[PDB]
Design a protein around this ligand. Structure first.
Ligand SMILES: CC(C)S(=O)(=O)NC[C@H](C)c1ccc(-c2ccc([C@@H](C)CNS(=O)(=O)C(C)C)cc2)cc1
Ligand SMILES: C=C(C)[C@H]1CN[C@H](C(=O)O)[C@H]1CC(=O)O
Lengths: 51, 51, 51, 85, 51, 85
Protein backbone atom coordinates (compact mmCIF):
# COMPACT_ATOMS: atom_id res chain seq x y z
CA UNK A 1 0.00 0.00 0.00
CA UNK A 2 0.83 3.69 0.02
CA UNK A 3 2.25 5.95 2.70
CA UNK A 4 0.20 7.18 5.66
CA UNK A 5 1.89 10.60 5.62
CA UNK A 6 4.43 12.51 3.52
CA UNK A 7 7.46 14.01 5.27
CA UNK A 8 11.24 14.24 4.98
CA UNK A 9 14.63 13.95 6.65
CA UNK A 10 17.02 16.86 7.17
CA UNK A 11 20.30 18.27 8.44
CA UNK A 12 19.87 19.84 11.87
CA UNK A 13 21.75 22.89 13.17
CA UNK A 14 21.46 24.94 16.40
CA UNK A 15 19.39 28.12 16.12
CA UNK A 16 21.63 31.06 15.25
CA UNK A 17 24.50 28.88 14.06
CA UNK A 18 26.78 30.18 11.32
CA UNK A 19 26.68 26.79 9.57
CA UNK A 20 22.93 26.74 8.88
CA UNK A 21 22.63 28.69 5.63
CA UNK A 22 25.76 27.16 4.07
CA UNK A 23 24.49 23.66 4.88
CA UNK A 24 21.06 24.46 3.47
CA UNK A 25 22.44 25.88 0.21
CA UNK A 26 24.64 22.79 0.02
CA UNK A 27 21.60 20.51 0.28
CA UNK A 28 19.92 22.52 -2.48
CA UNK A 29 22.90 22.37 -4.85
CA UNK A 30 23.32 18.64 -4.20
CA UNK A 31 19.60 18.24 -4.88
CA UNK A 32 19.66 19.97 -8.27
CA UNK A 33 22.95 18.37 -9.31
CA UNK A 34 21.40 14.97 -8.66
CA UNK A 35 23.98 14.01 -6.04
CA UNK A 36 21.30 13.00 -3.52
CA UNK A 37 19.56 10.77 -6.04
CA UNK A 38 22.80 9.12 -7.17
CA UNK A 39 23.68 8.58 -3.51
CA UNK A 40 20.39 6.87 -2.67
CA UNK A 41 20.66 4.70 -5.77
CA UNK A 42 24.17 3.85 -4.60
CA UNK A 43 23.17 2.79 -1.09
CA UNK A 44 19.64 1.44 -1.64
CA UNK A 45 19.17 0.00 -5.14
CA UNK A 46 22.39 -0.44 -7.20
CA UNK A 47 23.76 -3.27 -5.05
CA UNK A 48 20.23 -4.53 -4.39
CA UNK A 49 20.16 -8.25 -3.69
CA UNK A 50 16.54 -8.90 -4.67
CA UNK A 51 16.14 -9.55 -8.39
CA UNK B 1 18.39 17.28 19.19
CA UNK B 2 19.44 17.43 22.83
CA UNK B 3 23.13 17.40 21.97
CA UNK B 4 22.39 20.27 19.59
CA UNK B 5 20.46 22.40 22.11
CA UNK B 6 22.98 21.96 24.90
CA UNK B 7 25.89 22.53 22.54
CA UNK B 8 27.49 19.10 22.72
CA UNK B 9 27.44 18.91 18.92
CA UNK B 10 27.67 21.57 16.21
CA UNK B 11 25.68 19.73 13.54
CA UNK B 12 23.45 16.67 13.09
CA UNK B 13 23.56 14.46 10.00
CA UNK B 14 21.30 11.43 10.25
CA UNK B 15 17.88 10.16 9.19
CA UNK B 16 16.35 12.77 11.48
CA UNK B 17 12.65 13.21 10.72
CA UNK B 18 11.41 16.79 10.45
CA UNK B 19 8.77 17.56 13.07
CA UNK B 20 7.21 20.77 14.37
CA UNK B 21 8.47 20.09 17.90
CA UNK B 22 12.04 19.77 16.63
CA UNK B 23 11.65 22.72 14.28
CA UNK B 24 10.73 24.89 17.26
CA UNK B 25 13.97 24.27 19.18
CA UNK B 26 16.40 23.64 16.30
CA UNK B 27 16.84 24.65 12.67
CA UNK B 28 16.19 22.10 9.93
CA UNK B 29 17.78 22.30 6.50
CA UNK B 30 15.58 21.80 3.45
CA UNK B 31 14.88 18.06 3.29
CA UNK B 32 17.53 15.95 1.55
CA UNK B 33 15.30 12.88 1.47
CA UNK B 34 11.58 12.19 1.16
CA UNK B 35 9.76 9.47 3.10
CA UNK B 36 6.54 8.47 4.84
CA UNK B 37 5.06 6.03 7.33
CA UNK B 38 4.48 2.75 5.50
CA UNK B 39 3.49 -0.85 6.13
CA UNK B 40 5.80 -3.88 5.93
CA UNK B 41 4.70 -7.52 5.89
CA UNK B 42 5.98 -10.95 4.86
CA UNK B 43 5.66 -11.70 1.14
CA UNK B 44 3.03 -14.42 0.53
CA UNK B 45 3.48 -17.54 -1.60
CA UNK B 46 2.16 -17.56 -5.17
CA UNK B 47 -1.63 -17.86 -5.01
CA UNK B 48 -1.47 -20.61 -7.68
CA UNK B 49 -3.47 -20.42 -10.94
CA UNK B 50 -6.62 -22.10 -9.65
CA UNK B 51 -9.45 -23.30 -11.88
CA UNK C 1 0.67 -12.59 -32.67
CA UNK C 2 -2.11 -9.96 -32.75
CA UNK C 3 -3.14 -10.72 -29.18
CA UNK C 4 0.54 -10.40 -28.19
CA UNK C 5 0.47 -7.03 -29.93
CA UNK C 6 -2.35 -6.03 -27.60
CA UNK C 7 -0.30 -7.54 -24.77
CA UNK C 8 2.71 -5.44 -25.83
CA UNK C 9 3.83 -2.90 -23.22
CA UNK C 10 6.17 0.09 -22.72
CA UNK C 11 5.96 2.47 -25.68
CA UNK C 12 7.89 4.93 -23.48
CA UNK C 13 8.89 3.71 -20.01
CA UNK C 14 11.38 6.44 -19.09
CA UNK C 15 12.78 9.92 -19.75
CA UNK C 16 15.86 8.34 -21.35
CA UNK C 17 13.81 6.74 -24.11
CA UNK C 18 12.69 10.18 -25.26
CA UNK C 19 16.35 11.12 -25.56
CA UNK C 20 16.93 7.93 -27.56
CA UNK C 21 14.24 8.57 -30.20
CA UNK C 22 13.57 11.47 -32.58
CA UNK C 23 10.14 10.27 -33.72
CA UNK C 24 8.22 11.80 -30.81
CA UNK C 25 8.82 15.51 -30.33
CA UNK C 26 8.71 16.80 -26.75
CA UNK C 27 8.92 20.10 -24.88
CA UNK C 28 8.54 22.26 -21.78
CA UNK C 29 7.20 25.72 -20.90
CA UNK C 30 8.66 28.88 -22.47
CA UNK C 31 10.01 29.74 -19.02
CA UNK C 32 9.85 28.52 -15.44
CA UNK C 33 11.67 25.99 -13.27
CA UNK C 34 11.53 23.05 -15.68
CA UNK C 35 13.18 24.72 -18.67
CA UNK C 36 15.86 26.19 -16.40
CA UNK C 37 16.38 22.78 -14.85
CA UNK C 38 17.10 21.37 -18.30
CA UNK C 39 19.31 24.33 -19.26
CA UNK C 40 21.48 24.29 -16.14
CA UNK C 41 21.62 20.49 -15.91
CA UNK C 42 25.01 18.85 -16.48
CA UNK C 43 23.80 15.23 -16.25
CA UNK C 44 23.90 13.41 -19.60
CA UNK C 45 20.32 12.47 -20.58
CA UNK C 46 18.69 15.78 -19.61
CA UNK C 47 21.57 17.60 -21.33
CA UNK C 48 20.96 15.72 -24.58
CA UNK C 49 17.26 16.49 -24.25
CA UNK C 50 18.03 20.18 -23.78
CA UNK C 51 20.20 20.24 -26.89
CA UNK D 1 36.83 35.67 -25.99
CA UNK D 2 39.07 33.40 -23.88
CA UNK D 3 38.03 32.42 -20.34
CA UNK D 4 40.37 32.29 -17.36
CA UNK D 5 40.52 31.13 -13.75
CA UNK D 6 42.47 33.75 -11.81
CA UNK D 7 40.76 36.62 -13.63
CA UNK D 8 37.36 35.11 -12.86
CA UNK D 9 38.23 34.85 -9.18
CA UNK D 10 39.63 38.36 -8.71
CA UNK D 11 36.64 39.72 -10.61
CA UNK D 12 34.27 37.57 -8.54
CA UNK D 13 35.54 38.77 -5.17
CA UNK D 14 35.66 42.40 -6.30
CA UNK D 15 32.16 42.39 -7.81
CA UNK D 16 30.68 40.65 -4.77
CA UNK D 17 32.34 43.17 -2.45
CA UNK D 18 31.33 46.20 -4.51
CA UNK D 19 27.78 44.80 -4.62
CA UNK D 20 27.48 44.24 -0.86
CA UNK D 21 28.59 47.84 -0.34
CA UNK D 22 25.22 49.18 -1.56
CA UNK D 23 23.50 46.99 1.04
CA UNK D 24 25.61 48.21 3.99
CA UNK D 25 24.23 47.29 7.42
CA UNK D 26 21.87 44.68 5.99
CA UNK D 27 24.97 43.07 4.41
CA UNK D 28 24.66 39.63 6.03
CA UNK D 29 21.35 39.09 4.21
CA UNK D 30 22.42 39.91 0.64
CA UNK D 31 25.65 37.91 0.24
CA UNK D 32 24.02 35.25 -1.97
CA UNK D 33 22.31 37.96 -4.03
CA UNK D 34 25.53 39.86 -4.71
CA UNK D 35 27.25 36.54 -5.38
CA UNK D 36 24.58 35.83 -7.98
CA UNK D 37 25.19 39.17 -9.70
CA UNK D 38 28.93 38.62 -9.54
CA UNK D 39 28.63 35.17 -11.08
CA UNK D 40 26.56 36.74 -13.85
CA UNK D 41 29.00 39.56 -14.64
CA UNK D 42 32.22 37.57 -14.20
CA UNK D 43 30.79 34.38 -15.70
CA UNK D 44 31.18 30.83 -14.42
CA UNK D 45 32.21 27.48 -15.86
CA UNK D 46 29.27 25.88 -14.05
CA UNK D 47 26.18 28.05 -13.54
CA UNK D 48 25.43 26.29 -10.26
CA UNK D 49 28.93 26.62 -8.80
CA UNK D 50 29.42 30.30 -9.63
CA UNK D 51 32.59 32.32 -10.12
CA UNK D 52 34.06 31.45 -6.72
CA UNK D 53 32.20 29.03 -4.47
CA UNK D 54 34.57 29.00 -1.50
CA UNK D 55 34.64 32.78 -1.21
CA UNK D 56 30.86 32.81 -1.26
CA UNK D 57 30.64 30.26 1.54
CA UNK D 58 33.30 31.95 3.67
CA UNK D 59 31.56 35.31 3.30
CA UNK D 60 28.11 33.85 4.04
CA UNK D 61 29.26 32.26 7.30
CA UNK D 62 31.63 35.05 8.44
CA UNK D 63 29.83 38.28 7.47
CA UNK D 64 28.08 40.20 10.24
CA UNK D 65 26.29 43.57 9.82
CA UNK D 66 28.68 46.49 9.15
CA UNK D 67 31.64 44.09 9.45
CA UNK D 68 31.90 43.83 5.66
CA UNK D 69 35.35 45.31 4.93
CA UNK D 70 37.18 43.07 7.39
CA UNK D 71 35.15 40.03 6.35
CA UNK D 72 35.93 40.49 2.65
CA UNK D 73 39.58 41.28 3.38
CA UNK D 74 39.81 38.00 5.30
CA UNK D 75 37.79 35.94 2.82
CA UNK D 76 39.12 37.16 -0.53
CA UNK D 77 42.24 34.98 -0.45
CA UNK D 78 40.30 31.80 0.31
CA UNK D 79 40.34 28.85 -2.10
CA UNK D 80 37.36 28.87 -4.46
CA UNK D 81 37.21 25.08 -4.69
CA UNK D 82 36.37 23.10 -7.83
CA UNK D 83 34.62 25.18 -10.48
CA UNK D 84 33.20 22.05 -12.12
CA UNK D 85 30.59 20.60 -9.78
CA UNK E 1 9.88 36.76 -6.40
CA UNK E 2 10.45 40.27 -7.76
CA UNK E 3 7.41 41.67 -5.95
CA UNK E 4 8.82 40.18 -2.76
CA UNK E 5 12.40 41.43 -3.18
CA UNK E 6 11.43 44.97 -4.14
CA UNK E 7 8.87 45.04 -1.34
CA UNK E 8 5.64 45.23 -3.30
CA UNK E 9 4.44 42.07 -1.55
CA UNK E 10 4.91 40.69 1.97
CA UNK E 11 4.43 37.01 1.15
CA UNK E 12 4.06 34.68 -1.84
CA UNK E 13 1.62 31.75 -1.90
CA UNK E 14 1.47 29.88 -5.20
CA UNK E 15 2.89 26.73 -6.82
CA UNK E 16 6.37 28.24 -6.56
CA UNK E 17 9.07 25.63 -7.11
CA UNK E 18 12.08 25.69 -4.79
CA UNK E 19 15.26 26.35 -6.73
CA UNK E 20 18.76 27.31 -5.60
CA UNK E 21 18.59 30.49 -7.65
CA UNK E 22 15.39 31.47 -5.81
CA UNK E 23 16.62 30.28 -2.42
CA UNK E 24 19.53 32.68 -2.78
CA UNK E 25 17.40 35.80 -3.32
CA UNK E 26 14.38 35.00 -1.11
CA UNK E 27 13.57 32.65 1.76
CA UNK E 28 11.53 29.48 1.27
CA UNK E 29 9.34 27.82 3.89
CA UNK E 30 9.52 24.06 4.36
CA UNK E 31 7.80 22.46 1.34
CA UNK E 32 4.02 22.12 1.61
CA UNK E 33 3.82 19.94 -1.50
CA UNK E 34 6.11 17.48 -3.30
CA UNK E 35 6.49 17.19 -7.07
CA UNK E 36 8.86 16.40 -9.92
CA UNK E 37 9.46 16.81 -13.64
CA UNK E 38 7.23 14.27 -15.39
CA UNK E 39 6.17 13.14 -18.87
CA UNK E 40 2.67 13.53 -20.31
CA UNK E 41 1.21 11.93 -23.46
CA UNK E 42 -2.08 11.04 -25.13
CA UNK E 43 -3.67 7.83 -23.85
CA UNK E 44 -4.43 5.29 -26.63
CA UNK E 45 -7.93 3.95 -27.30
CA UNK E 46 -8.82 0.27 -27.71
CA UNK E 47 -12.56 0.94 -28.03
CA UNK E 48 -14.76 -0.27 -30.89
CA UNK E 49 -12.54 -3.03 -32.35
CA UNK E 50 -15.30 -4.28 -34.65
CA UNK E 51 -15.87 -7.60 -36.42
CA UNK F 1 41.53 20.77 0.86
CA UNK F 2 40.39 22.94 -2.07
CA UNK F 3 42.83 23.48 -4.95
CA UNK F 4 41.47 26.91 -5.96
CA UNK F 5 42.39 28.21 -9.42
CA UNK F 6 45.09 30.85 -9.21
CA UNK F 7 47.30 28.87 -6.84
CA UNK F 8 47.08 25.94 -9.26
CA UNK F 9 47.91 28.17 -12.25
CA UNK F 10 50.89 29.96 -10.73
CA UNK F 11 52.07 26.55 -9.56
CA UNK F 12 51.62 25.17 -13.08
CA UNK F 13 53.61 27.89 -14.84
CA UNK F 14 56.28 27.82 -12.14
CA UNK F 15 56.75 24.05 -12.35
CA UNK F 16 56.73 24.02 -16.17
CA UNK F 17 59.31 26.80 -16.31
CA UNK F 18 61.50 25.31 -13.59
CA UNK F 19 61.39 21.95 -15.37
CA UNK F 20 62.18 23.39 -18.81
CA UNK F 21 65.16 25.19 -17.27
CA UNK F 22 66.77 21.78 -16.72
CA UNK F 23 66.79 21.08 -20.46
CA UNK F 24 68.96 23.68 -22.18
CA UNK F 25 68.57 24.07 -25.94
CA UNK F 26 66.03 21.25 -26.03
CA UNK F 27 63.46 23.53 -24.39
CA UNK F 28 61.00 23.46 -27.31
CA UNK F 29 61.02 19.64 -27.36
CA UNK F 30 60.32 18.94 -23.68
CA UNK F 31 57.46 21.42 -23.19
CA UNK F 32 54.83 18.67 -23.17
CA UNK F 33 56.92 16.53 -20.81
CA UNK F 34 57.35 19.34 -18.29
CA UNK F 35 53.66 20.20 -18.65
CA UNK F 36 52.85 16.59 -17.80
CA UNK F 37 55.07 16.63 -14.71
CA UNK F 38 53.74 20.06 -13.71
CA UNK F 39 50.14 18.89 -14.01
CA UNK F 40 51.13 15.93 -11.85
CA UNK F 41 52.70 18.07 -9.13
CA UNK F 42 50.06 20.81 -9.15
CA UNK F 43 47.08 18.53 -9.76
CA UNK F 44 44.27 19.19 -12.22
CA UNK F 45 40.47 19.36 -12.19
CA UNK F 46 40.43 17.48 -15.47
CA UNK F 47 43.43 15.17 -15.85
CA UNK F 48 43.31 15.59 -19.63
CA UNK F 49 43.26 19.39 -19.59
CA UNK F 50 46.05 19.81 -17.05
CA UNK F 51 46.74 22.63 -14.61
CA UNK F 52 46.77 25.38 -17.26
CA UNK F 53 46.03 24.43 -20.87
CA UNK F 54 46.34 27.82 -22.53
CA UNK F 55 49.77 28.33 -21.01
CA UNK F 56 50.85 24.94 -22.36
CA UNK F 57 49.67 25.75 -25.88
CA UNK F 58 51.24 29.21 -25.69
CA UNK F 59 54.59 27.75 -24.65
CA UNK F 60 54.48 25.02 -27.31
CA UNK F 61 53.76 27.53 -30.08
CA UNK F 62 56.12 30.25 -28.83
CA UNK F 63 59.12 28.49 -27.27
CA UNK F 64 62.16 28.05 -29.48
CA UNK F 65 65.54 26.58 -28.42
CA UNK F 66 67.44 28.85 -25.97
CA UNK F 67 64.48 31.27 -26.07
CA UNK F 68 63.04 29.86 -22.82
CA UNK F 69 63.16 32.85 -20.45
CA UNK F 70 61.44 35.37 -22.74
CA UNK F 71 58.90 32.84 -23.98
CA UNK F 72 57.88 31.93 -20.43
CA UNK F 73 57.83 35.56 -19.31
CA UNK F 74 55.44 36.25 -22.18
CA UNK F 75 53.30 33.13 -21.74
CA UNK F 76 52.74 33.09 -17.97
CA UNK F 77 50.04 35.79 -18.01
CA UNK F 78 47.93 34.07 -20.70
CA UNK F 79 44.38 32.81 -20.08
CA UNK F 80 44.28 29.12 -19.12
CA UNK F 81 40.91 28.36 -20.70
CA UNK F 82 38.26 25.95 -19.42
CA UNK F 83 39.75 23.77 -16.63
CA UNK F 84 36.84 21.31 -16.70
CA UNK F 85 36.87 20.55 -20.43
C1 LIG G 1 14.29 21.44 -3.31
C2 LIG G 1 15.14 20.36 -2.66
C3 LIG G 1 16.26 20.98 -1.84
S1 LIG G 1 14.17 19.47 -1.66
O1 LIG G 1 12.88 19.32 -2.27
O2 LIG G 1 14.02 20.19 -0.43
N1 LIG G 1 14.82 18.03 -1.36
C4 LIG G 1 14.86 16.98 -2.36
C5 LIG G 1 14.34 15.67 -1.76
C6 LIG G 1 14.35 14.52 -2.75
C7 LIG G 1 12.98 15.93 -1.25
C8 LIG G 1 12.01 16.49 -2.08
C9 LIG G 1 10.74 16.75 -1.60
C10 LIG G 1 10.43 16.44 -0.28
C11 LIG G 1 9.10 16.74 0.28
C12 LIG G 1 8.59 16.00 1.35
C13 LIG G 1 7.34 16.34 1.87
C14 LIG G 1 6.63 17.42 1.34
C15 LIG G 1 5.33 17.80 1.90
C16 LIG G 1 4.28 16.73 1.60
C17 LIG G 1 5.54 18.01 3.40
N2 LIG G 1 6.75 18.78 3.62
S2 LIG G 1 7.65 18.61 4.93
O3 LIG G 1 8.87 19.34 4.76
O4 LIG G 1 7.94 17.22 5.14
C18 LIG G 1 6.80 19.20 6.23
C19 LIG G 1 7.71 19.22 7.45
C20 LIG G 1 6.28 20.60 5.92
C21 LIG G 1 7.16 18.16 0.30
C22 LIG G 1 8.39 17.82 -0.23
C23 LIG G 1 11.40 15.91 0.55
C24 LIG G 1 12.68 15.64 0.07
C1 LIG H 1 2.99 26.54 -13.77
C2 LIG H 1 4.09 27.26 -13.88
C3 LIG H 1 4.27 28.17 -15.05
C4 LIG H 1 5.16 27.17 -12.82
C5 LIG H 1 4.72 26.29 -11.65
N1 LIG H 1 5.98 25.74 -11.18
C6 LIG H 1 7.10 26.08 -12.02
C7 LIG H 1 7.89 27.21 -11.41
O1 LIG H 1 7.94 27.28 -10.17
O2 LIG H 1 8.46 28.02 -12.17
C8 LIG H 1 6.45 26.54 -13.31
C9 LIG H 1 6.15 25.34 -14.20
C10 LIG H 1 7.39 24.78 -14.87
O3 LIG H 1 8.45 25.44 -14.85
O4 LIG H 1 7.29 23.67 -15.44
Amino acid sequence: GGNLDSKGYGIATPKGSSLGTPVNLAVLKLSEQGVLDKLKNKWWYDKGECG
Amino acid sequence: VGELVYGKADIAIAPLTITLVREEVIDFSKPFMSLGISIMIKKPQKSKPGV
Amino acid sequence: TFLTVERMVSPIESAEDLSKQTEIAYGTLDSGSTKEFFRRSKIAVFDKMWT
Amino acid sequence: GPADCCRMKECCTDRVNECLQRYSGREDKFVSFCYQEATVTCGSFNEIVGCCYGYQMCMIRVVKPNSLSGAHEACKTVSCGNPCA
